[PDB]
Write an enzyme that holds these catalytic residues in place. Sequence first.
Site, PDB file in Angstrom:
ATOM      1  CD  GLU A   1      48.645 -18.858 -19.875  1.00  0.00           C
ATOM      2  OE1 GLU A   1      49.118 -19.369 -18.843  1.00  0.00           O
ATOM      3  OE2 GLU A   1      49.321 -18.195 -20.696  1.00  0.00           O
TER       4      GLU A   1
ATOM      5  CG  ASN B   1      57.761 -22.662 -13.004  1.00  0.00           C
ATOM      6  OD1 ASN B   1      56.832 -22.599 -12.208  1.00  0.00           O
ATOM      7  ND2 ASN B   1      57.613 -23.025 -14.271  1.00  0.00           N
TER       8      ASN B   1
ATOM      9  CG  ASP C   1      62.272 -18.922 -12.010  1.00  0.00           C
ATOM     10  OD1 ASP C   1      63.468 -18.851 -12.371  1.00  0.00           O
ATOM     11  OD2 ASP C   1      61.342 -18.337 -12.589  1.00  0.00           O
TER      12      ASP C   1
ATOM     13  CB  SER D   1      58.199 -21.137  -9.210  1.00  0.00           C
ATOM     14  OG  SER D   1      58.948 -20.854 -10.377  1.00  0.00           O
TER      15      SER D   1
ATOM     16  CG  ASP E   1      53.924 -23.071 -13.194  1.00  0.00           C
ATOM     17  OD1 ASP E   1      54.207 -22.242 -12.300  1.00  0.00           O
ATOM     18  OD2 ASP E   1      54.455 -23.072 -14.319  1.00  0.00           O
TER      19      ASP E   1
ATOM     20  CG  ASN F   1      54.594 -18.676  -9.108  1.00  0.00           C
ATOM     21  OD1 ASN F   1      53.648 -18.113  -8.566  1.00  0.00           O
ATOM     22  ND2 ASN F   1      55.764 -18.076  -9.285  1.00  0.00           N
TER      23      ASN F   1
HETATM   24  C1  LIG Z   1      52.448 -22.607 -20.305  1.00  0.00           C
HETATM   25  C2  LIG Z   1      51.848 -21.224 -20.330  1.00  0.00           C
HETATM   26  O1  LIG Z   1      50.834 -20.885 -20.911  1.00  0.00           O
HETATM   27  N1  LIG Z   1      52.552 -20.341 -19.577  1.00  0.00           N
HETATM   28  C3  LIG Z   1      53.963 -20.569 -19.285  1.00  0.00           C
HETATM   29  C4  LIG Z   1      54.227 -20.718 -17.796  1.00  0.00           C
HETATM   30  O2  LIG Z   1      53.678 -21.952 -17.267  1.00  0.00           O
HETATM   31  C5  LIG Z   1      55.746 -20.773 -17.641  1.00  0.00           C
HETATM   32  O3  LIG Z   1      56.023 -20.564 -16.240  1.00  0.00           O
HETATM   33  C6  LIG Z   1      55.647 -19.395 -15.428  1.00  0.00           C
HETATM   34  O4  LIG Z   1      55.653 -19.899 -14.074  1.00  0.00           O
HETATM   35  C7  LIG Z   1      55.504 -18.811 -13.276  1.00  0.00           C
HETATM   36  C8  LIG Z   1      55.994 -19.213 -11.906  1.00  0.00           C
HETATM   37  O5  LIG Z   1      57.056 -20.104 -11.914  1.00  0.00           O
HETATM   38  C9  LIG Z   1      54.007 -18.538 -13.328  1.00  0.00           C
HETATM   39  O6  LIG Z   1      53.708 -17.394 -12.514  1.00  0.00           O
HETATM   40  C10 LIG Z   1      54.122 -16.029 -12.851  1.00  0.00           C
HETATM   41  O7  LIG Z   1      55.541 -15.948 -12.525  1.00  0.00           O
HETATM   42  C11 LIG Z   1      55.967 -14.729 -13.034  1.00  0.00           C
HETATM   43  C12 LIG Z   1      57.484 -14.717 -13.055  1.00  0.00           C
HETATM   44  O8  LIG Z   1      57.988 -13.779 -13.958  1.00  0.00           O
HETATM   45  C13 LIG Z   1      55.353 -13.686 -12.099  1.00  0.00           C
HETATM   46  O9  LIG Z   1      55.887 -12.353 -12.311  1.00  0.00           O
HETATM   47  C14 LIG Z   1      56.146 -11.518 -11.136  1.00  0.00           C
HETATM   48  O10 LIG Z   1      55.144 -12.062 -10.200  1.00  0.00           O
HETATM   49  C15 LIG Z   1      55.228 -11.438  -8.983  1.00  0.00           C
HETATM   50  C16 LIG Z   1      54.212 -12.105  -8.071  1.00  0.00           C
HETATM   51  O11 LIG Z   1      52.951 -11.520  -8.121  1.00  0.00           O
HETATM   52  C17 LIG Z   1      54.947  -9.955  -9.252  1.00  0.00           C
HETATM   53  O12 LIG Z   1      54.915  -9.184  -8.058  1.00  0.00           O
HETATM   54  C18 LIG Z   1      53.769  -8.332  -7.698  1.00  0.00           C
HETATM   55  O13 LIG Z   1      53.849  -7.088  -8.475  1.00  0.00           O
HETATM   56  C19 LIG Z   1      53.112  -6.095  -7.839  1.00  0.00           C
HETATM   57  C20 LIG Z   1      52.762  -5.028  -8.880  1.00  0.00           C
HETATM   58  O14 LIG Z   1      53.189  -5.315 -10.186  1.00  0.00           O
HETATM   59  C21 LIG Z   1      54.046  -5.601  -6.727  1.00  0.00           C
HETATM   60  O15 LIG Z   1      53.441  -4.520  -5.936  1.00  0.00           O
HETATM   61  C22 LIG Z   1      54.075  -3.223  -5.466  1.00  0.00           C
HETATM   62  O16 LIG Z   1      54.620  -2.409  -6.551  1.00  0.00           O
HETATM   63  C23 LIG Z   1      54.665  -1.073  -6.068  1.00  0.00           C
HETATM   64  C24 LIG Z   1      55.159  -0.183  -7.212  1.00  0.00           C
HETATM   65  O17 LIG Z   1      54.853   1.180  -7.069  1.00  0.00           O
HETATM   66  C25 LIG Z   1      55.558  -0.985  -4.776  1.00  0.00           C
HETATM   67  O18 LIG Z   1      55.270   0.246  -4.035  1.00  0.00           O
HETATM   68  C26 LIG Z   1      55.435  -2.118  -3.737  1.00  0.00           C
HETATM   69  O19 LIG Z   1      56.600  -2.074  -2.861  1.00  0.00           O
HETATM   70  C27 LIG Z   1      55.241  -3.434  -4.507  1.00  0.00           C
HETATM   71  N2  LIG Z   1      54.996  -4.570  -3.606  1.00  0.00           N
HETATM   72  C28 LIG Z   1      56.028  -5.223  -2.973  1.00  0.00           C
HETATM   73  C29 LIG Z   1      56.255  -4.765  -1.544  1.00  0.00           C
HETATM   74  O20 LIG Z   1      56.695  -6.057  -3.573  1.00  0.00           O
HETATM   75  C30 LIG Z   1      54.485  -6.712  -5.768  1.00  0.00           C
HETATM   76  O21 LIG Z   1      55.942  -6.743  -5.840  1.00  0.00           O
HETATM   77  C31 LIG Z   1      53.846  -8.095  -6.181  1.00  0.00           C
HETATM   78  N3  LIG Z   1      52.523  -8.485  -5.566  1.00  0.00           N
HETATM   79  C32 LIG Z   1      52.011  -9.807  -5.619  1.00  0.00           C
HETATM   80  C33 LIG Z   1      53.038 -10.870  -5.305  1.00  0.00           C
HETATM   81  O22 LIG Z   1      50.838 -10.052  -5.906  1.00  0.00           O
HETATM   82  C34 LIG Z   1      55.977  -9.313 -10.125  1.00  0.00           C
HETATM   83  O23 LIG Z   1      55.724  -7.896 -10.210  1.00  0.00           O
HETATM   84  C35 LIG Z   1      55.769 -10.048 -11.405  1.00  0.00           C
HETATM   85  N4  LIG Z   1      56.528  -9.386 -12.468  1.00  0.00           N
HETATM   86  C36 LIG Z   1      56.181  -8.103 -12.849  1.00  0.00           C
HETATM   87  C37 LIG Z   1      57.350  -7.260 -13.316  1.00  0.00           C
HETATM   88  O24 LIG Z   1      55.013  -7.732 -12.764  1.00  0.00           O
HETATM   89  C38 LIG Z   1      53.830 -13.610 -12.137  1.00  0.00           C
HETATM   90  O25 LIG Z   1      53.391 -12.720 -11.085  1.00  0.00           O
HETATM   91  C39 LIG Z   1      53.341 -15.052 -11.943  1.00  0.00           C
HETATM   92  N5  LIG Z   1      51.882 -15.200 -12.174  1.00  0.00           N
HETATM   93  C40 LIG Z   1      51.081 -16.077 -11.450  1.00  0.00           C
HETATM   94  C41 LIG Z   1      50.083 -16.823 -12.299  1.00  0.00           C
HETATM   95  O26 LIG Z   1      51.214 -16.208 -10.236  1.00  0.00           O
HETATM   96  C42 LIG Z   1      53.446 -18.205 -14.711  1.00  0.00           C
HETATM   97  O27 LIG Z   1      52.044 -18.544 -14.670  1.00  0.00           O
HETATM   98  C43 LIG Z   1      54.210 -18.972 -15.819  1.00  0.00           C
HETATM   99  N6  LIG Z   1      54.270 -18.185 -17.082  1.00  0.00           N
HETATM  100  C44 LIG Z   1      53.773 -16.891 -17.258  1.00  0.00           C
HETATM  101  C45 LIG Z   1      54.114 -15.940 -16.131  1.00  0.00           C
HETATM  102  O28 LIG Z   1      53.123 -16.599 -18.259  1.00  0.00           O
HETATM  103  C46 LIG Z   1      56.569 -19.782 -18.500  1.00  0.00           C
HETATM  104  C47 LIG Z   1      58.063 -20.070 -18.485  1.00  0.00           C
HETATM  105  O29 LIG Z   1      58.843 -18.952 -18.202  1.00  0.00           O
HETATM  106  O30 LIG Z   1      56.142 -19.931 -19.812  1.00  0.00           O
HETATM  107  C48 LIG Z   1      54.799 -19.444 -19.853  1.00  0.00           C
HETATM  108  O31 LIG Z   1      54.478 -19.406 -21.252  1.00  0.00           O
END
Ligand SMILES: CC(=O)N[C@@H]1[C@@H](O)[C@H](O[C@@H]2O[C@H](CO)[C@@H](O[C@@H]3O[C@H](CO)[C@@H](O[C@@H]4O[C@H](CO)[C@@H](O[C@@H]5O[C@H](CO)[C@@H](O[C@@H]6O[C@H](CO)[C@@H](O)[C@H](O)[C@H]6NC(C)=O)[C@H](O)[C@H]5NC(C)=O)[C@H](O)[C@H]4NC(C)=O)[C@H](O)[C@H]3NC(C)=O)[C@H](O)[C@H]2NC(C)=O)[C@@H](CO)O[C@H]1O
Length: 129
Positions: A35, A46, A48, A50, A52, A59
């Site tokens: 990470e 990002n 996007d 976004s 970090d 993000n």
């Molecule tokens: C360098 C290194 O080691 N890592 C690299 C990294 O730095 C690079 O960049 C990436 O940056 C992103 C941001 O720009 C960092 O953050 C992650 O971003 C990813 C994007 O893909 C996020 O993925 C989605 O995130 C959202 C936000 O949480 C998720 O949404 C949540 O999901 C829940 C459940 O799964 C949902 O709840 C409910 O679901 C039920 C189903 O039955 C439904 O009834 C409900 O209606 C529903 N809720 C509603 C109303 O929506 C809910 O939607 C939501 N809840 C929240 C917001 O908490 C979404 O689901 C994610 N995708 C899936 C599919 O799960 C990720 O969340 C985010 N993480 C962080 C840390 O915040 C990231 O750190 C980083 N890399 C990563 C992700 O590894 C990348 C370059 O691409 O390279 C990496 O190597």
Amino acid sequence: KVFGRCELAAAMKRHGLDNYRGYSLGNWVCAAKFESNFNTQATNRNTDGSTDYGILQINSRWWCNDGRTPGSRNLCNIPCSALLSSDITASVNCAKKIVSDGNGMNAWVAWRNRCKGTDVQAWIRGCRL
Ligand SMILES: CC(=O)N[C@@H]1[C@@H](O)[C@H](O[C@@H]2O[C@H](CO)[C@@H](O[C@@H]3O[C@H](CO)[C@@H](O[C@@H]4O[C@H](CO)[C@@H](O[C@@H]5O[C@H](CO)[C@@H](O[C@@H]6O[C@H](CO)[C@@H](O)[C@H](O)[C@H]6NC(C)=O)[C@H](O)[C@H]5NC(C)=O)[C@H](O)[C@H]4NC(C)=O)[C@H](O)[C@H]3NC(C)=O)[C@H](O)[C@H]2NC(C)=O)[C@@H](CO)O[C@H]1O
């Protein structure tokens, strides 16, 4: 700072993560070197738009306040830079339930590929704890 391998992992077992919420303390430390490569000053923006923050690399779009992200939820309700500093005593509190929202490590992406389906358990190996 520069956390060497044995010196950037024992803190989880100091922050309430050992075997915390179905994830063993060991199921975490691997991703840390996937990470930020043991650093809290490694951060990116990002495609996007976004940004970090920290070794944690969260993000601003969905989790914290940097202000350049409008329409961001910020349920964490604390300044993003509150993590990037060498000290991290408080910084885990948000990562602590980011799973509690019910999506698991699925919010984190590298851990599903670099540590998942592999032996992470062989990463925490050898440090006395
Ligand atoms: C360098 C290194 O080691 N890592 C690299 C990294 O730095 C690079 O960049 C990436 O940056 C992103 C941001 O720009 C960092 O953050 C992650 O971003 C990813 C994007 O893909 C996020 O993925 C989605 O995130 C959202 C936000 O949480 C998720 O949404 C949540 O999901 C829940 C459940 O799964 C949902 O709840 C409910 O679901 C039920 C189903 O039955 C439904 O009834 C409900 O209606 C529903 N809720 C509603 C109303 O929506 C809910 O939607 C939501 N809840 C929240 C917001 O908490 C979404 O689901 C994610 N995708 C899936 C599919 O799960 C990720 O969340 C985010 N993480 C962080 C840390 O915040 C990231 O750190 C980083 N890399 C990563 C992700 O590894 C990348 C370059 O691409 O390279 C990496 O190597």
